[PDB]
């Protein structure tokens, strides 16, 4: 009656997983809850592997392998050296693409050739290299912003023309957006069917991003500053989530604030028997900041004081209501 079936390049791992994702994330439809498992592997592998500077070697490999010829060798031997020494200097903390260096060398031979239109073999050599760097000139990092930034606006463009008043009258504006053809309309019409599913899922893109945003970038915050304005019942948390982004720029939401309580606490705490952080203890109990995330995580940390300190404030942060006339830490069996 029943049946279940277990039945099933890094250059491509980046690009490929993304291509799957843009069909996923154009708004195809999500079949089940189980999806919410699928994205974490996809997206931590992505975010983490997009910082990973072993991508460009394969990206400078792959265009430059299929265009190894047709090439002016002065510019080629210089650039092909420096990929080799992109490769030698990889795994350094301070490795950035040598865009202007590779670009300038070509412009040594653009300085002499480029005034002449003698250049259509050369055009595909003076473009193909500037296009390698064009994925990556500002590093993986401006681009990894831009790309996620674009796709989020991709969600937006489709779904902003779609609703402006009410679905019916608006569909004529959709009809009229692409009067000549309606195939573009079909992806449009198809996209907005599962917006509500989509809406939580937009948070994902920003969520691990925002995990280490907190001082990111104005041209982006501009796009972000658009996000607070989202004005619909379904997109009202998400709209409000922009605020969650806009505030965590002050008060962050990752291991750094796990570090922040760690920092403040271990620094603040006396760590003798005195342990006089009563003002901070009342600041924990009259904390503008919520301090139940990691403080409970630490009153069982490996640090005997942080046991003691964090633990009694947790007590006190529980029983803030009752009157406490004695609290002694004991240290038993061992």
């Amino acid at each position: 009656h029943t049946g279940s079936l277990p039945r099933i390049k890094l250059h491509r791992v980046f690009h490929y997983v993304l291509d799957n994702l843009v069909n996923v994330m154009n708004g195809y439809c999500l079949p089940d809850p189980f999806f919410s498992s699928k994205v974490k592997d996809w997206v931590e592998r992505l975010m983490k592997t997009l910082r990973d500077p072993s991508l460009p070697l394969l990206e400078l490999q792959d265009i430059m392998t299929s265009v190894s010829g047709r090439i002016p060798p002065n510019v080629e031997k210089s650039i092909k050296k420096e990929m080799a020494q992109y490769a030698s200097n990889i795994t350094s903390v301070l490795c950035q693409f040598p865009s202007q260096q590779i670009a300038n060398i070509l412009d040594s031979h653009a300085a002499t050739l480029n005034r002449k239109s003698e250049r259509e073999v050369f055009f595909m050599n003076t473009q193909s290299i500037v296009q390698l760097v064009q994925r990556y000139r500002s590093g993986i990092r401006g681009h990894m912003k831009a790309v996620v930034m674009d796709l989020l606006r991709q969600y937006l463009r489709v779904e902003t023309q779609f609703q402006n008043g009410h679905y019916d009258k608006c569909v004529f504006a959709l009809r009229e957006e692409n009067k000549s053809d309606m195939n573009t309309v079909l992806n449009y019409i198809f996209s907005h069917a599962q917006v509500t599913k989509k809406n939580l899922l937009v948070t994902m893109l920003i969520d691990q991003l925002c995990g280490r945003d907190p001082t990111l970038t104005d041209e982006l915050l501009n796009i972000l500053t658009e996000l607070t304005q989202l004005s619909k019942t379904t997109n009202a948390k998400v709209a409000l989530r922009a605020r969650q982004v806009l505030i965590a720029s002050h008060l962050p939401s990752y291991e750094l604030r796990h570090n922040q309580v760690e920092s403040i606490f271990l620094s603040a705490i006396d760590m003798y028997g005195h342990q006089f952080c009563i003002e901070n203890l009342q600041k924990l109990i009259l904390s503008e900041t919520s301090i139940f995330d990691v403080l409970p995580n630490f009153f069982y940390h490996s640090n005997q004081v942080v046991r003691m300190a964090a633990l009694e404030v947790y007590v006190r942060r529980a029983y803030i209501a009752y009157e406490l006339n004695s609290v002694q830490h004991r240290q038993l069996k061992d």
């Binding site: 260096q101 300038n104 653009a110 500037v130 064009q134 500002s138 041209e219 570090n259 922040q260």
Partner: protein, 129 residues
Amino acid sequence: KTSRTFFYWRLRRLLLEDLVKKKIHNANPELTDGQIQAMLRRWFVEVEGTVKAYVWDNNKDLAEWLEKQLTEEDGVHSVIEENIKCISRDYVLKQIRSLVQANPEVAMDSIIHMTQHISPTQRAEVIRI
């Protein structure tokens, strides 16, 4: 007969490229005349989509186009503006990194003052590394 019409836009456009490269060059004085152009062509070709590259050989259209990127403040056009800062940051970044390499003794005293304000979590980050 029509060379004037052509030349006006042409001369004005020669200037914008020159004008922006001085801005990038202002962002980073060590930069050569030649390499800035590639960056510019690439920044030109990139922003509008590699598809709009060909437009570059039309004097008039770029005159209209470059100003909008530069002129329209706080839009989604402040891309080159963000980009030029990166080179400025990069050239600046190279100096801070380079001076200790050339002058490691300056590091200790330089950091205490340099590190003197950043978030406490960031203070935590120095301890982890």
